Write an enzyme that holds these catalytic residues in place. Structure first.
Site, PDB file in Angstrom:
ATOM      1  N   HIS B  89       4.053 -11.016  31.829  1.00 26.36           N
ATOM      2  CA  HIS B  89       4.863 -12.237  32.103  1.00 26.36           C
ATOM      3  C   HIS B  89       5.877 -12.552  30.963  1.00 26.36           C
ATOM      4  O   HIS B  89       5.959 -11.883  29.928  1.00 26.36           O
ATOM      5  CB  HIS B  89       3.907 -13.377  32.173  1.00 26.36           C
ATOM      6  N   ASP B  91       7.071 -16.073  28.758  1.00 23.96           N
ATOM      7  CA  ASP B  91       6.245 -17.326  28.587  1.00 23.96           C
ATOM      8  C   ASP B  91       6.750 -18.509  29.399  1.00 23.96           C
ATOM      9  O   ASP B  91       7.947 -18.700  29.551  1.00 23.96           O
ATOM     10  CB  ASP B  91       6.086 -17.759  27.117  1.00 23.96           C
ATOM     11  N   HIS B 223       5.768  -9.724  28.173  1.00 28.66           N
ATOM     12  CA  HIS B 223       4.748  -9.051  27.381  1.00 28.66           C
ATOM     13  C   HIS B 223       3.384  -9.044  28.054  1.00 28.66           C
ATOM     14  O   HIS B 223       3.183  -9.718  29.096  1.00 28.66           O
ATOM     15  CB  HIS B 223       4.604  -9.751  26.021  1.00 28.66           C
ATOM     16  N   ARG B 238      -0.168 -19.074  18.470  1.00 29.88           N
ATOM     17  CA  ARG B 238       1.174 -19.001  18.988  1.00 29.88           C
ATOM     18  C   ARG B 238       1.892 -20.319  18.803  1.00 29.88           C
ATOM     19  O   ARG B 238       1.305 -21.388  19.049  1.00 29.88           O
ATOM     20  CB  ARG B 238       1.117 -18.702  20.470  1.00 29.88           C
TER      21      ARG B 238
HETATM   22 FE   LIG Z   1       2.675 -14.919  26.833  1.00 31.33          FE
END
Ligand SMILES: [Fe+2]
Ligand SMILES: [Fe+2]
Ligand SMILES: [Fe+2]
Ligand SMILES: [Fe+2]
Lengths: 249, 259, 259, 249
Positions: B89, B91, B223, B238
């Site tokens: 996907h 983000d 990714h 993240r």
């Molecule tokens: Fe992601």
């Protein structure tokens, strides 16, 4: 011997350190190598810059009888395959040396076809057990054989999908059903989780169990020079879950 | 400034060495990192073992306005991923202005497995034959937050990148359907375009070490987090940076349609 | 002349009544049959029990220059099908100028099963969203005679019909691949376009009686012979009429590439 | 009674002549009807212009207990389905009268899901036997149930695929594998050979064994008026090859 074995990915691949490859390794190093190979499906040795066409060939013979078609590749194997599956007794293993290595790109990826089978829900493994497929050389990067889609591995006894781009079709099903079933079983082999990617250096060697892997060579290095040289070892005739054998047709 | 930049794969990905990421890097080093990012789509910094929750956050701010989503304690914006994103996907594409970038740090790193793979959605685009570029230009997709590992929005399938001018495929596993097409037609058009994104040639795989940091241009990548490590602990953290509203080939803009 | 024309299905197919097919029909009746054909794509005449091998051949000639392929005895052009065409295709698209039309007569007709289905490739075309019409315009396919029930040629996927001006999908099970595309991409683009051709809405099924005769515009249909009758005898006899060289949306022409 | 039964297609469908349908047919005509129905999966009666909402309803009850959701359809059922398979005990049968019939278009097509199963190669029937699927009403033309993909028919004992557009997914497989497997089994049901198409006249009636068919209503009549009215009959709970039952969830 417990050699110095560092797994590369969760479910396939291991680097082996502290071993210079030669035509002169002793049965213990050779057997340990052979068990690392069956366990991890593909094994890698770095800095083998002392090696050259003849050491490769003589190092090879320590692990079974070499078979023709030392091969030079320079055009490019970017489709998921198992070496030479259009013959009945296709290689049990390949040994590949990096002669010229591109600065970026040029990688290789292996898929463990045993684990691929293991993860299929039971009913979809039962059906894989009963399928056969026609392998042809209509496709070669460098004959029509019927192999069971499930190969019982002559040494581990591990069952593995026997598929790849050499497959012309699944025997006994329409075009449309052969594509659907091959997409399912095939997409299980190439699932990222079941693979390991090697970025090559000049002198790196990789050895894989072709009874139990597929592999793909990434074509992303444009016109950077890439030369690898390969020795394969003769293999057994595939035996399916029900004991039936492959037959070249 | 020429940073010390080693490309990882033929078509995406670069390690940057000799740089120690901090809330205190000078504008120059930041600009050079912004250029590497746009050029290489994902960039890697090893051995950032001095970074922590707060320095990751402070470092992020040097590259844009961080945004949230439930965050890690002590932080304004930090999302912890553990106990998995194994699905291609881009983000948060279920929102209208999805992050332009995420900065990910490895806190705990499995001895085996645990890898992550990025795909260069702009290269995926360049490689399609002209006629299928032309069609991809003309399509739209609905993204939803049904399928989340950590709302419906309509995006063109081709995003014109606000800095490079490069066009990129805008797809991934947030896509519910291609607007305007049967279910069978959606799945077949999706499958064609997606399959260019994930083609091995267009990807780069990273094996994590504790203290590795990755930064990707979310406008031009997908990714995937490889789920092969069993019960081995894996902790990553993240920070995402606010992104612009995507602009299609012919200037059209995305529009959120359920919230 | 207004013939007595009853449409069979919403979008293709018409029975013509009160006409007794012969080598001796006047130009008017022939022109009206040519108009019904182009309009309805396939037309049906019941109870032609007087027709025979020779009258079928002589009647054919009134609609164009018949052509062969091993033919039925007593005839110049008649192909017998028995002992099966159960696969969506357009006739002989592996040659450059494939028949514009085939005339098929039922000689022996199963008590159950034995049917035939036609699909309106021009309607299949009209129904595709603009962008996918645009892409279909731009594609080409290789047809081969590997897959025959009774040579490689390159055809646009969209044929501009030489009399109606209507565009039609040019596909079917003679297609080996879409030129210019991977195998996976070919199969997915083929599957999308094909699936419009065979969509039930675009089709008409005929149940045969001995003496039924069907005529279809092969430039704008595919058809399919339903294989459900077991060992019940089925004999049909076909005459094809020579066709023009297909012309694509932008005037390009097909080219044979192996013979 | 041997009624006057003329098969429509090679592998499903039969017209029944010399029978005016009423709430007053005698057990022999009714049983013969019920065996024609099980044998041929769908049965048709022409010129039933004497019939009206109440005769339909009272003719229906002679063949089991009617169930709600007399239904009026006027918007259009063009996707291959089995009536109401998002419930556990979905109809055993439907009875459909043509009230208004378009001059061109408007047809209906049935697929025999028993024969569909029969023609699958053995290994692909074994796998169908072990699959389950989730039916939902996310789709309705006029709830989440788990049914086995293979229904053993409570009367013939014939096994039939239990699939259609009500299926949300195959239980226990990824998105991608559920689509591939459903495409295979589903494309066997709709194969032309397994279907029969009815062009309707005003007053035509059709009755189908919903345990053993799917059907699709062709949307090609544009704005021509089409009204059909339907009565369904309650059905048993699906029992799979291994005896397990469906469960509404
Ligand atoms: Fe992601
Ligand atoms: Fe190879
Ligand atoms: Fe034909
Ligand atoms: Fe229905």
């Amino acid at each position: 011997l417990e050699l110095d074995v560092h797994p590369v990915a969760g479910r396939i691949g291991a680097e082996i350190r502290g071993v210079k490859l030669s035509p002169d390794l002793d049965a213990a190093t050779v057997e340990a190598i052979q068990a690392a190979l069956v366990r991890h499906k593909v094994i890698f040795f770095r800095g083998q810059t002392h090696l050259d066409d003849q050491s490769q060939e003589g190092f090879a013979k320590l692990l079974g009888e070499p078979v023709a078609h030392l091969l030079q590749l320079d055009q490019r194997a970017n489709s998921w395959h198992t070496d030479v599956t259009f013959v009945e007794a296709y290689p049990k293993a390949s040994i590949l040396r990096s002669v010229v290595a591109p600065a970026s790109g040029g990688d290789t990826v292996w898929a463990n076809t045993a684990a691929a089978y293991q993860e299929l829900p039971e009913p979809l493994r039962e059906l894989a057990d009963k399928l056969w497929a026609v392998h042809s050389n209509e496709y070669d990067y460098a004959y029509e054989t019927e192999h069971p889609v499930v190969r019982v591995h002559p040494i581990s006894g591990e069952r593995a999908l026997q598929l790849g781009h050499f497959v012309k079709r699944i025997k006994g099903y329409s075009l449309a059903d052969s594509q659907h079933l091959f997409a399912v079983l095939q997409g299980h082999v190439t699932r990222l989780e079941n693979t390991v990617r090697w970025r090559w250096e000049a002198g790196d060697v990789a050895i894989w169990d072709n009874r139990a892997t597929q592999h793909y060579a990434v074509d992303d290095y444009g016109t950077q020079p890439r030369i690898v040289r390969r020795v394969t070892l003769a293999g057994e005739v595939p035996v399916g879950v029900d004991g039936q054998l492959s037959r070249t047709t």
